[PDB]
Write a protein that binds this ligand. Structure first.
Ligand SMILES: COc1ccc(N(C(=O)Nc2ccccc2Cl)c2ccnc(N[C@@H](C)C(C)(C)O)n2)cc1
Length: 334
């Protein structure tokens, strides 16, 4: 066991191993706070996230355990993974803090203030990470610019995916309006929104609320034909769509006038209302727009991922002990 040291950063306390030096606060949440640091063992800059109150309820506890499990599993260049996990606790009984460490990333994409080959490379890498996450049967559910991290080199990683766990601007219409049996393609919608906005410089669908969001989406993609209408189980939703004065599908060339037409065509395949008809991440990577980057021998899939725990309704101590086990059993990357 290594030696630890305490300091007090901006209202919060931090006890981290001596391995990590020069913590500078970098952001925060009800979920946790983050510091950049220097990792004396590798010479690299890293990010250490302290979870806020990991075991404050059975739902905090289960979330903690979810995040750790997911992260122990994610091993892909375009996905945030786990360099380290540690607790100052020397026993399960004193176990009440969790710290997570990964490579430090310079910025996120809401910050970015793009050209065609920039859009190509960034979307290519998101899709490549999503292909991997989707293959473990994980759905991100909240892909947005602020969740995608990027260096000045334009290397990109997805943060905070998985697995259970305005944002509404990038949300797919089926998840928005509470058709609670979606699929992985909800993420492909978000990707279309992100990509639209990188090429265009504005938010594709800036809803002021969920109803308005839906109205903006229907404006571009048109109201469902009977084919999609018949798969809508809720007369609430069905009637609302069937109360909305009809609207035609716009031609994407006009709305994304001056954009590479190959991007216009990808977007058309991503931004379909019918999630049974939406292109998947693997299909998207093979689309012509990414010809400069696609390589079917270097778009790996994931080991299968046991998320059975998700149906379990356990005690706080139970979730806490399971999290501790995972911490103990952690095997550093080479
Ligand atoms: C496995 O353990 C970690 C360790 C750190 C993180 N992390 C964050 O959670 N950051 C973050 C997220 C939301 C809001 C503010 C922040 Cl600062 C990271 C990871 C890498 N790089 C960053 N950079 C910050 C500066 C960012 C660009 C995301 O704002 N944050 C993720 C997983």
């Amino acid at each position: 066991r290594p030696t630890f040291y305490r300091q007090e950063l901006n209202k919060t306390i931090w006890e981290v191993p001596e391995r990590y030096q020069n913590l500078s606060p970098v952001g925060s949440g009800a979920y946790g706070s983050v510091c950049a640091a220097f990792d004396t063992k590798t010479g690299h800059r890293v990010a250490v996230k302290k979870l806020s109150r990991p075991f404050q309820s059975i739902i905090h506890a289960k979330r903690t355990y979810r995040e750790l499990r997911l992260l122990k599993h994610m091993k892909h260049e375009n996905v945030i993974g786990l360099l380290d996990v540690f607790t100052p606790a020397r026993s399960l009984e004193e176990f009440n803090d969790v710290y997570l460490v990964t490579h430090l990333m310079g910025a996120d994409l809401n910050n970015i203030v793009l050209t065609d080959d920039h859009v190509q490379f960034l979307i290519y890498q998101i899709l490549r990470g999503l292909k991997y996450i989707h293959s473990a049967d994980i759905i991100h559910r909240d892909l947005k610019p602020s969740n995608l991290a990027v260096n000045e080199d334009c290397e990109l990683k997805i943060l905070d995916f998985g697995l259970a766990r305005a944002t509404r601007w990038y949300r797919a219409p089926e998840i928005m309006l509470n058709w609670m049996h979606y699929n992985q393609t909800v993420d492909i919608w978000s990707v279309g929104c992100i990509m639209a906005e990188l090429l265009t410089g504005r938010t594709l669908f800036p809803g002021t609320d969920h109803i308005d969001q839906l109205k903006l989406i229907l404006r571009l993609v048109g109201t469902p034909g009977a084919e999609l209408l018949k798969k809508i189980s809720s007369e609430s939703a069905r009637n609302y769509i069937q109360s909305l004065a009809q609207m035609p599908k716009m031609n994407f060339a006009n709305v994304f006038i001056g954009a590479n037409p190959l991007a216009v065509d990808l977007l058309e395949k991503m931004l379909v209302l019918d999630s049974d008809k939406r292109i998947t991440a693997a299909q998207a990577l093979a689309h012509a727009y990414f010809a400069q980057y696609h390589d079917p021998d270097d778009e790996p899939v994931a080991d299968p991922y046991d998320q059975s725990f998700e149906s379990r309704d356990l005690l706080i101590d139970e979730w806490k002990s399971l999290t501790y086990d995972e911490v103990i059993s952690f095997v550093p990357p080479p």
